[PDB]
């Protein structure tokens, strides 16, 4: 029976491949060769954010493009103020090891995670004026990877047990379980419709999940090694991945196919974080080679390099309104680039 | 414009407060030395750390020679650790507690050590080797039923190193086999590593009263080499 199951699974797989081939026809590059290149985008450092103690893993821009929160191995959840380069708050975590950060779009809550299998929730606007633990969401086993706020009361969070849990801070219970990945999921991003997200595991695959019904609508494949960077396109019908094999793809949700590879031979180390800009001609991606660069998402061309970093780059976030981008590397530094 | 003025003043006040607190946290973060425990599934991690506590993650804090260390017993995770082991890059050293009696998993132990040394982000940090379960090894070598020569045919074509320092109450057979295990790890240790990070093996048992001293010595040597390289004295 197992042989028949494998045979029919292979039949379905090659049927999907044949459908993809039939729905390919023409490539994006051939039809997009008439677009003007972006060209070199010479970008300097504006104000450096030096307040962190150890390596920085995650940062998230706020909705107002004013204040943002970042991670550090010390156990700090510092929230910065972009224009004035100021510390608005400092949340000391119980667990020193943290790997994820999210800022609630309502502007009153900040999340965190880490090896402790606890996706701790903190509040900001409080009567006493001091931050505190709002709710200690628990239930995972594997290490926690990325978290984002669906709304003011629910968070979707990715762990290291190949299971993704959607929560409810008010009840502290796992509303839904997304068990469709084989390897550990690294990063998931929020589509503007706040009903869909894509989860990328260490099996070089990205599987699309829907928030409401909680099932894997579709999957995306084409990478060679583990992927640890993700972000939706602002329109919500595209998303680019950064793996460890120095390749960035671009899969479209509607067609379920790879579009193009963002790579060059001289790059030998993989991408860590990605962040789509507000328009599309700008595609940013960090690199292990002590620097971060920006790709042209429609012409497969590098446009400038945000050099000036020591150690590895691991986080990348452009403001919602597109004023600037903050890149944090392992040197406990955050830099603002226009 | 007065509202913007007072808002900016409030943010600057918050900054001075937070910077004072963060400098206070600076004074302690570097003081604590991070350590990491890795090894076989039954390798003696939790019970050794529990034993030395008297002097998910099963953390621990202890004070030796007026300097504080942090030992991590990561056990609340899966058996895949290709990815979260990168978080421990800025860690003073790695402890490698390995089974010494059960030779069946010794090959897996060799492979695990070889992977740790040659990793492309752990090459900066040194590795400390604990050959735990010495009483069991001594007891079971005396029986001789295991036939250690089976799992490694080159075990016989070997003699004790000239620099061997056995305890007077030991046995030539157990010591000869035991230094065989050490040397067969160190041939892996020397084969790669261009002076950036050093391996220091220490013969330790689960219940020992001087386990902390060996950790102190190893971390002292590792930080000494790193710091001398940091200057021009190399």
């Amino acid at each position, epitope marked *: 029976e197992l042989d028949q199951l494998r045979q029919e699974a292979e039949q379905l797989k090659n049927q999907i491949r044949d459908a993809r081939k039939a729905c390919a026809d023409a490539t994006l590059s051939q039809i997009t060769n008439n677009i003007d290149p972006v060209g070199r985008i010479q970008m300097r450092t504006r104000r450096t954010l030096r307040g962190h103690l150890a390596k920085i893993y995650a940062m998230h821009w706020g909705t107002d493009s004013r204040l943002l929160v970042s991670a550090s191995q010390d156990g700090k959840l510092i929230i910065w103020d972009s224009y004035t380069t100021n510390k608005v708050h400092a949340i000391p975590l119980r667990s020193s090891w943290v790997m994820t950060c999210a800022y609630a779009p309502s502007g009153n809550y900040v999340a965190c995670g880490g090896l402790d299998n606890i996706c701790s929730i903190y509040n900001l606007k409080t009567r006493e004026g001091n931050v505190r633990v709002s709710r200690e969401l628990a239930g995972h086993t594997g290490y926690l990877s990325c978290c984002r706020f669906l709304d003011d009361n629910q968070i979707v969070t990715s762990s290291g047990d190949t299971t993704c849990a959607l929560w409810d801070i008010e009840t502290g219970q796992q509303t839904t379980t997304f068990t469709g990945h084989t*390897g550990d999921v690294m990063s998931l991003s929020l589509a503007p419709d706040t009903r869909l997200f894509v989860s990328g595991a260490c099996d070089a695959s990205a599987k699309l999940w829907d928030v409401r019904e909680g099932m894997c609508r579709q999957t995306f494949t084409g990478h060679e090694s583990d992927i640890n960077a993700i972000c939706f396109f602002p329109n919500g019908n595209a998303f680019a991945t950064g793996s460890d*094999d120095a390749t960035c793809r671009l899969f479209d949700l509607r067609a379920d196919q790879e579009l193009m590879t963002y790579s060059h031979d001289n790059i030998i180390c993989g991408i860590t974080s990605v962040s789509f800009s507000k328009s599309g001609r700008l595609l940013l991606a960090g690199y292990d080679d002590f620097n971060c660069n920006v790709w042209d998402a429609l012409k497969a061309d590098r446009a400038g390099v945000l050099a000036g970093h020591d150690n590895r780059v691991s986080c990348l976030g452009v403001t919602d309104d597109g004023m600037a981008v903050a890149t944090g590397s392992w040197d406990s530094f955050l830099k603002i680039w226009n | 414009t007065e509202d913007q003025r007072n808002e900016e003043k409030a943010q600057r006040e918050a900054n001075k407060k937070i910077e004072k607190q963060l400098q206070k946290d600076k004074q302690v973060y570097r003081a604590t030395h991070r350590l990491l425990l890795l090894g076989a599934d039954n390798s003696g991690k939790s019970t050794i750390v529990k034993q030395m506590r008297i002097l998910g993650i099963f953390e621990t804090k202890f004070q030796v020679d007026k300097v504080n260390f942090h030992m991590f017993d990561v056990g609340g995770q899966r058996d895949e650790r290709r990815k979260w082991i990168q978080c421990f890059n800025d860690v003073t050293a790695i402890i490698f507690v390995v089974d010494s009696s059960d030779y069946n998993r010794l090959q*897996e132990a060799l492979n695990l050590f070889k992977s740790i040394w040659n990793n492309r982000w752990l090459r900066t940090i040194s590795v400390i080797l604990f050959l735990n379960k010495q009483d069991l090894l001594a007891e079971k070598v005396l029986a001789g039923k295991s036939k250690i020569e089976d*799992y490694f045919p080159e075990f016989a074509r070997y003699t004790t190193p000239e620099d061997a320092t056995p305890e007077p109450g030991e046995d030539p057979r157990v010591t000869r086999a035991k230094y065989f295990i050490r040397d067969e790890f160190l041939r892996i240790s020397t084969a790669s590593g261009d002076g950036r990070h050093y391996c220091y093996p220490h013969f330790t048992c689960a219940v020992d009263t001087e386990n902390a001293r060996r950790i102190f010595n190893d971390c002292k040597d590792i930080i000494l080499q790193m710091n001398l390289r940091e200057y021009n004295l190399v």
Partner: nanobody
Amino acid sequence: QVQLQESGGGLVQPGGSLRLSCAASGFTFSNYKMNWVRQAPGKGLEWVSDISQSGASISYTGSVKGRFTISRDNAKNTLYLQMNSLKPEDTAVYYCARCPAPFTRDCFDVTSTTYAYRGQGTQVTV
């Protein structure tokens, strides 16, 4: 998509020869470092032998030194493992493993849990 299919392997008495082939797809064969993993019945998972990018970095496990022979064909995306003079204990299942990261020498694929980049395996019985 990355696939690793193993070929060969049959019921052979102690002695004789067996040919084992790995069918590789979805990735670049040359740069990645590849190794084989064994699975003794009622026991855990282990490693067989590894070949680096150059092909001149052959190393052997302690169990087999002159008994085994590892080779690969980068042009045809095939990795080979030559058997001769088998023993009853080597009654494992042979998975075509591969270290994930390009251009490196480290991989943790001795995991018991289902690692992504290794095949369904072929049974060899002695």
